[PDB]
Design a protein around this ligand. Structure first.
Ligand SMILES: *[C@@H]1O[C@H](CO)[C@@H](O[C@@H]2O[C@H](CO)[C@@H](O)[C@H](O)[C@H]2NC(C)=O)[C@H](O)[C@H]1NC(C)=O
Ligand SMILES: *[C@@H]1O[C@H](CO)[C@@H](O[C@@H]2O[C@H](CO)[C@@H](O)[C@H](O)[C@H]2NC(C)=O)[C@H](O)[C@H]1NC(C)=O
Ligand SMILES: *[C@@H]1O[C@H](CO)[C@@H](O[C@@H]2O[C@H](CO)[C@@H](O)[C@H](O)[C@H]2NC(C)=O)[C@H](O)[C@H]1NC(C)=O
Ligand SMILES: *[C@@H]1O[C@H](CO)[C@@H](O[C@@H]2O[C@H](CO)[C@@H](O)[C@H](O)[C@H]2NC(C)=O)[C@H](O)[C@H]1NC(C)=O
Ligand SMILES: *[C@@H]1O[C@H](CO)[C@@H](O[C@@H]2O[C@H](CO)[C@@H](O)[C@H](O)[C@H]2NC(C)=O)[C@H](O)[C@H]1NC(C)=O
Ligand SMILES: *[C@@H]1O[C@H](CO)[C@@H](O[C@@H]2O[C@H](CO)[C@@H](O)[C@H](O)[C@H]2NC(C)=O)[C@H](O)[C@H]1NC(C)=O
Lengths: 228, 318, 83
């Protein structure tokens, strides 16, 4: 418990420095803000376009020419500006679709990673999922995923089954390993050797059909008690 | 599953004006449409490479299969790389590449060009080979941390327990399961070689892009209400007082056509991005692990999956 | 607009994406910053700009055998961000 607590505290301590030091970790939200600002600024700047007219200012056009020519000039300007507005609206609709997709993904992630534990690989982090915590950021969410990663691995010699008294034994929930001399049964994700007994093995058939079976002994807990 | 789309670039001046300078001078007076169009096309181009990176570049290291290829009776010859051919591709990959395929010069002379991808086919093949080596030698352990070796029959026993069937079922039926797997791979190769309509999606993507480019090229033969579809004959046959109307109308028509092209490309890019995201999810949960979701990684109880690369897409064998 | 870079001093490289002038090709392979295309990409280090073929990652080989297994003996808790 103490080691796990210390590791978690160290990770949460380091995450703030990791966020602060790198100035491009929050690039998605900044990209959203920049895209909106650029679209609006471009729409503002389009008002200075002449679009084939004598001038981009309407008052002078009305004050200098007759209705027959002022009409065509202002029609040109009106057409150009309406085209600009329509382009802006279409681009906004496409960006809204993209943001809706991202929001649906965020909702699914908060439902499955924060409100429960997920068995989906690489969905709530890199590794084996434990839990997640949400935080709010301008125009978005930030998930902190806690993950179990194995380390300090060791080699061993394995065997599919153990033949004893003309019977084949298989592990209920573990794997058979050997350190060179003796055989043990251990869980597949953490090394914890144990003595092969009848409690942690089950029998199925004789031992002349399984390729790679290994001779050894299985210790029955009942005999020492009934012999004492 | 399609992953990427063809990257295109468009030159404004050569499309709208061509070889006329006064047309360029007038075009300077219609705003910053070209900056918008170029920016959108560049964004799509970068997004394509991002899609390919997300789908394929998921393993930190490049794993290699052992020199001796014995895996408990399973063959794996039809999906592992072949060292004889220079491209270093599996047979299935070779069929997939050979099954999906002056107009380019005509398009180029009008200002429409195609940019090359960042990742060549050899690099994608190398990534797929690394994924296959990892899933054969290690299992699902290489996607959750360091890669740990485990014999293949024991991996299949674990995957049998994952679907509610005990280990003895595999261990007493090893040869039958191996023979069924080998026959299934052979039938997959034969069926892929025989039927030519299996690769319809990628061909559809390619055809749609080509058709859009052809329509854009053919829009230059329209008059839009002017007196001719060529700028030089308009400028050489009228006075500057009256040529402006014709040139303005032609320019507006061509700008509208090119805007429509850009909008269609944006919508198609959104669809391809959705497909690429689905492909990345499938690579994460069907190849790097075992999935309990029904019908996500095939019809039946999922055991495993193998990736292969195809032109602008991925092929999963479940 | 009259800024041509002639030759030699900036070197000339023929890639599949075009002609590169100003960068020197190197035989090394690095995880690169500025993508150019066709697997060729550039960076800044020597002092000058260098172009190279990007490296996909470190080569690894897993000791596969009929009767060899690897089992962890320790663990690590990791906290990761997703925005
Ligand atoms: C398990 O055994 C394998 C092979 O016996 C080890 O892989 C070797 O590691 C050494 C490093 O000490 C290298 O010099 C060899 O080239 C490796 N051989 C192969 C075939 O890859 C592996 O290191 C062992 N595992 C542990 C945790 O020590
Ligand atoms: C394999 O593991 C067994 C069990 O831990 C080891 O046997 C013990 O080894 C220690 C080390 O000297 C002795 O003090 C014990 O008395 C041994 N117990 C028994 C029941 O034999 C064995 O030495 C290990 N083998 C190797 C090669 O490390
Ligand atoms: C495991 O034990 C069995 C039986 O104890 C061994 O099978 C015997 O091997 C001897 C050879 O020394 C033969 O003479 C016998 O006919 C075999 N059968 C029996 C019932 O004794 C077997 O060799 C041992 N080792 C392995 C790897 O299975
Ligand atoms: C244990 O592995 C070895 C290989 O490391 C197997 O021996 C044969 O090795 C050759 C190498 O040229 C392969 O082509 C064969 O496929 C391997 N098997 C056979 C039956 O020849 C050996 O078979 C493996 N052990 C068992 C019990 O299958
Ligand atoms: C894996 O399958 C391939 C076929 O895809 C086998 O190669 C064939 O071997 C037979 C020998 O009976 C030849 O007649 C065929 O011409 C071979 N085909 C090809 C494409 O090479 C290969 O032998 C199988 N693997 C093993 C270990 O047997
Ligand atoms: C498992 O790993 C932890 C660290 O991840 C090890 O704890 C470290 O042990 C060394 C040596 O005693 C100390 O110098 C460190 O300060 C410890 N770290 C922490 C965070 O307490 C632990 O010893 C490892 N366990 C095994 C069995 O190897």
């Amino acid at each position: 418990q103490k080691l796990i607590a210390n590791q978690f505290n160290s990770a949460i301590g380091k995450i703030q420095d990791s966020l602060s030091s790198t100035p491009s970790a929050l690039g998605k939200l900044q990209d959203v803000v920049n895209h909106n600002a650029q679209a609006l600024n471009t729409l503002v700047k389009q008002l200075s376009s002449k679009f084939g007219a004598i001038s981009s200012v309407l008052n002078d056009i009305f004050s200098r020419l007759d209705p027959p020519e002022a009409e065509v000039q202002i029609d040109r300007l009106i057409t150009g500006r309406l085209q600009s507005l329509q382009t802006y609206v279409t681009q906004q609709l496409i960006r809204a679709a993209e943001i809706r997709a991202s929001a649906n993904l965020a909702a699914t992630k908060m439902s499955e990673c924060v409100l429960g534990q997920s068995k989906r690989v690489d969905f709530c982090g890199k590794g084996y999922h434990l839990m997640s915590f949400p935080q709010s950021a301008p125009h978005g969410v930030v998930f902190l995923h806690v993950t179990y990663v194995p380390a300090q691995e060791k080699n061993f010699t394995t065997a599919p089954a153990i033949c004893h008294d003309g019977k084949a034994h298989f592990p209920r929930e573990g794997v058979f390993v050997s350190n060179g001399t003796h055989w043990f049964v251990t869980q597949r994700n953490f090394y914890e050797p144990q003595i092969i007994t009848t409690d942690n093995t089950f029998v199925s058939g004789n031992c002349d059909v399984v390729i790679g079976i290994v001779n050894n002994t299985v210790y029955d807990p009942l005999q020492p008690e009934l012999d004492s | 599953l399609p992953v990427s789309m063809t990257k295109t670039s468009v030159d404004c001046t050569m499309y709208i004006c061509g070889d006329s300078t006064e047309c360029s001078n007038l075009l300077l007076q219609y705003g910053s449409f070209c900056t918008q169009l170029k920016r959108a096309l560049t964004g799509i181009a970068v997004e394509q490479d991002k899609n390919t990176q997300e789908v394929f570049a998921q393993v930190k290291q490049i794993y290699k299969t052992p020199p001796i290829k014995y895996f408990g009776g399973f063959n794996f010859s039809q999906i592992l790389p072949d060292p004889s051919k220079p491209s270093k591709r599996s047979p299935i990959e070779d069929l997939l590449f050979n099954k999906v395929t002056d107009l380019i010069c005509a398009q180029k002379f009008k200002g429409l060009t195609v940019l090359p991808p960042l990742l060549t086919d050899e690099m994608i093949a190398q990534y797929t080979s690394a994924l296959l080596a990892g899933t054969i030698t290690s299992g699902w352990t290489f996607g959750a941390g360091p890669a740990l070796q485990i014999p293949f029959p024991m991996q299949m026993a674990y995957r049998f327990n994952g679907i509610g069937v005990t280990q003895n079922v595999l261990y007493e039926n090893q040869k039958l399961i191996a023979n069924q797997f080998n026959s299934a791979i052979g039938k997959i190769q034969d069926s892929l070689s025989s039927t030519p309509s299996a690769l319809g999606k990628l061909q559809d993507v390619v055809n749609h892009n080509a058709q859009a480019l052809n329509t854009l090229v053919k829009q230059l033969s329209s008059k839009f209400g002017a007196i001719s579809s060529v700028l030089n004959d308009i400028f050489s046959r009228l006075d500057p007082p009256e040529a402006e109307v014709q040139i303005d109308r032609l320019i507006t028509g061509r700008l509208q056509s090119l805007q429509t092209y850009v909008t269609q490309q944006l919508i198609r890019a959104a669809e391809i991005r959705a497909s690429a995201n689905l492909a990345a999810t499938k690579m994460s949960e069907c190849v790097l692990g075992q999935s309990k979701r029904v019908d996500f990684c095939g019809k039946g109880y999922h055991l495993m999956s193998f990736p292969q690369s195809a032109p602008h897409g991925v092929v999963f064998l479940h | 607009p009259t800024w041509r870079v002639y030759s030699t001093g900036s070197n000339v490289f023929q890639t599949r994406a075009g002609c590169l002038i100003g960068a020197e090709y190197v035989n090394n392979s690095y995880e690169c910053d500025i993508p150019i295309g066709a697997g060729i990409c550039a960076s800044y280090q020597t002092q000058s700009i260098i172009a190279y073929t990007m490296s996909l990652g470190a080569e690894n080989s897993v000791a596969y055998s009929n009767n060899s297994i690897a089992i962890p003996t320790n663990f690590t808790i990791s906290v990761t961000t997703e925005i």
